[PDB]
Symmetry: C4
Subunit: 52 residues, 4 copies
């Protein structure tokens, strides 16, 4: 439209990309560490149960 609403759209867009990238990083990390805890807990409990 004009010079103002475009410069605003550019600010919103660029920072949105930043926010989105940092979001995905945190999302994948949370997922990664939670999967590890599940794996470790499962393996250990299975070891305990296998040890009378």
């Amino acid at each position: 439209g004009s010079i103002i609403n475009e410069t605003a759209d550019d600010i919103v867009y660029r920072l949105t990309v930043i926010i989105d990238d940092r979001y995905e990083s945190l999302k994948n990390l949370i997922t990664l560490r939670a999967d590890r805890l599940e794996m470790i807990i499962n393996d250990n409990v299975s070891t305990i149960l296998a040890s009378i």
Copy 2:
């Protein structure tokens, strides 16, 4: 308000919607995974106690 004041509110508002959405996502993911770990732990302890 003035043009620039309305444009400032719009930039903040839009990026706040973004930040909030991403925050809720991580908030929900963290809660989901932690809740599941507690579910897994509580179940495993019940099995270990049943196996004496």
Copy 3:
């Protein structure tokens, strides 16, 4: 005048509050769920050890 400088300062300042508030919320949530899980584990292990 200087309204563009001030508005940019005003924009950065407002979104900083948003970002920091959500950060603290996630920081406390992550910290809270970790304390809970550690407590649950320690409690359960003591229960298991009390049952030979």
Copy 4:
């Protein structure tokens, strides 16, 4: 080179620095608390396994 194009670059950069700072803190927090939980889980299981 424009009046507001530099302003936009400043706003995005200034908030990017803040986002990066908070993102890194959560990343470190998530890593540290998960590393801690994994240690606690294994240390506890070693105790149980050592109790017939």
